[PDB]
Amino acid sequence: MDVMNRLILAMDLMNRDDALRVTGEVREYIDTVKIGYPLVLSEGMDIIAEFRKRFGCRIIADFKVADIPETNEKICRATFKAGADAIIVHGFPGADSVRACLNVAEEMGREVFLLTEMSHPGAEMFIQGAADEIARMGVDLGVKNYVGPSTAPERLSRLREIIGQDSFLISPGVGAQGGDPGETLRFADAIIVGRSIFLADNPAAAAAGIIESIKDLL
Amino acid sequence: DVMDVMNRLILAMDLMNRDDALRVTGEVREYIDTVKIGYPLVLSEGMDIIAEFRKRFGCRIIADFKVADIPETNEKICRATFKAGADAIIVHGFPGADSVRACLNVAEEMGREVFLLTEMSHPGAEMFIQGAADEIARMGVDLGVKNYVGPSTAPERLSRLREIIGQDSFLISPGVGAQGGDPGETLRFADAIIVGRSIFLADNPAAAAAGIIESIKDLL
Ligand SMILES: O=c1cc(O)n([C@@H]2O[C@H](COP(=O)(O)O)[C@@H](O)[C@H]2O)c(=O)[nH]1
Numbered sequence A: 001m002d003v004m005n006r007l008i009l010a011m012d013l014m015n016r017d018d019a020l021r022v023t024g025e026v027r028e029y030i031d032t033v034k035i036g037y038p039l040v041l042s043e044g045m046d047i048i049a050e051f052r053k054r055f056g057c058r059i060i061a062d063f064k065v066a067d068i069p070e071t072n073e074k075i076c077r078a079t080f081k082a083g084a085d086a087i088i089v090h091g092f093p094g095a096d097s098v099r100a101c102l103n104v105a106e107e108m109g110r111e112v113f114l115l116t117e118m119s120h121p122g123a124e125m126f127i128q129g130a131a132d133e134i135a136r137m138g139v140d141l142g143v144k145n146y147v148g149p150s151t152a153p154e155r156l157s158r159l160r161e162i163i164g165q166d167s168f169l170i171s172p173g174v175g176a177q178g179g180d181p182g183e184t185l186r187f188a189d190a191i192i193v194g195r196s197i198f199l200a201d202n203p204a205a206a207a208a209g210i211i212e213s214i215k216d217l218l
Numbered sequence B: 001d002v003m004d005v006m007n008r009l010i011l012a013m014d015l016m017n018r019d020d021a022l023r024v025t026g027e028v029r030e031y032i033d034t035v036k037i038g039y040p041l042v043l044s045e046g047m048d049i050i051a052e053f054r055k056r057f058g059c060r061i062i063a064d065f066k067v068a069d070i071p072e073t074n075e076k077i078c079r080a081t082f083k084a085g086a087d088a089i090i091v092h093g094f095p096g097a098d099s100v101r102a103c104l105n106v107a108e109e110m111g112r113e114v115f116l117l118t119e120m121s122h123p124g125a126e127m128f129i130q131g132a133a134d135e136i137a138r139m140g141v142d143l144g145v146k147n148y149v150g151p152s153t154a155p156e157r158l159s160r161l162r163e164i165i166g167q168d169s170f171l172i173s174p175g176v177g178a179q180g181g182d183p184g185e186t187l188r189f190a191d192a193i194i195v196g197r198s199i200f201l202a203d204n205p206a207a208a209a210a211g212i213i214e215s216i217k218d219l220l
C-alpha cells in the first residue's frame, strides 16, 4: 500500500459538511483516509462512496471488528459493499474471528489490518500483556497489515520486530495523544493523525507542518 | 430496578435485508419486547433502522456494537448511538477501564444504559478473553456497571460471572440455539437469553420463539 506522505487522516468529525470540507482542505497532502464509527454512525455508510467520488482516496474502515466469526463475516461484507478498501479488526477475540475477516477480504479483493495493541492508557490492563501473542497469531494466519501504538515507541518497535520488515504497519496516537511523527515512522510505514489536523485552527497548515517535520523520511 | 424483558427472551436481529428483518421481527412481536440490533443490520440499512423498529414494534433496542476503541472515540460512538434512539449499548471490557468509563459517562449524561461484555461464546474466546474475564468482570463491578453479557456456551464460566457480579446485576446471554447453548440451563444464571438464527432462519420464526418459551415456561 502506497500512502502519500506516509500520512493517513483519521476523519472522526461527525458532521458530514465539516468532514467533507476539512478533508478537502488537506487533500493535496493525503490519498488515504481512515473512516470510523463516529462518522459512519452519524452520516451513514454512503459517506464512503462520497469520499471516493470527491477525493479518489483509499478508505480504511476502522471498525475494530470484535465479534464471533459468524457476525464478523457479515460486518466485513457490509463494510466492503460500501466501498471500503480495508478494515481494521481486533485480535483479542482470537484466531477464528480474525480468519472470518480474512476470508471475506480475500473474496472481495480487500485487506485486513490486525490491531495488536492500542495507544490509550487502558491498553495496559489487558491488551499489552497479550500483544506479542496476538502479533504472532497474525503471522501464523498470514496477516500482512498491522496497527500498533505511537504512544509507546518501544512497543511499536517490538511489534515491527515480530511481524518483520515485509509487513505493513500503521500507527495512531500521533499528535493529540502525544506521539511524535518522526519517531513513530522509525517503525511504522505510516502514521494516523486525527484531531491534530481536523481540530486545528488551520487544518491545511497543520498537515503541511507534520509533513515538513518528517520531510527527510519521505 | 432492571429492564423488564418479556419472556426472558431477546431477539438477535442479524438479518441484513431490511424487508426480511422487519418481517421476522413483526412475526415474533407477541413473544418479545426487546431486540438486539447489531452491525450486520446497522451497516446494511443505517442507524435509522432503530427508528423504524421503534415505530413499527413496541420494542426496546439494545445496540450490540461491542464498543472497543479509545475513550475519545468510544464517547462519540455512544453519543451517536443513543442519539438514534438505542436504549442501551454493549461495550467490550478488554480495552480497559478508561474505555469503559467513557461509555458509562455518556450513558449517564444521556439517560441510557451500558452492558459490559466480559467474555464471549465462540471458540476463539479461549485464546485471550477467558484469561482476562474474571478481572474484566471485577473491573465492571468496581466501575458501577449494572448490566453484563456472558456466554451460554460455557455454563461453568457463566455461573462464575454471575457470582462475581452478584444477584442484583442484570445478565444477558447469547449462544443459545445455533451455537448449542440450552435455554433453561442458561436461565439458571442469566436474566435473559439472546437468540438469533434459530428464530430468524426458522421456517416459522413465531413457532420457533413459542417453542423456546414453552421449554422455559416454569422459569417465567
Ligand atoms: O490504539 C488505537 C487504535 C486506533 O484505531 N485509534 C484511532 O486512531 C484515531 C486517533 O485520532 P487522534 O489523532 O485524534 O488521536 C482515532 O480514530 C482512534 O479511534 C487510536 O487512537 N488508538
Ligand SMILES: O=c1cc(O)n([C@@H]2O[C@H](COP(=O)(O)O)[C@@H](O)[C@H]2O)c(=O)[nH]1
Residues within 6 Å of the ligand: A067, A068, A071, B012, B014, B038, B064, B117, B119, B120, B121, B122, B149, B150, B151, B174, B175, B176, B177, B178, B179, B194, B195, B196, B197, B198
Ligand atoms: O459472546 C457473544 C457475544 C455476542 O454479542 N454474540 C452475539 O449474539 C448473537 C448470537 O446469534 P445466534 O443465536 O444466531 O448465534 C449474534 O448477534 C452475536 O454477534 C454472540 O454470539 N456471542
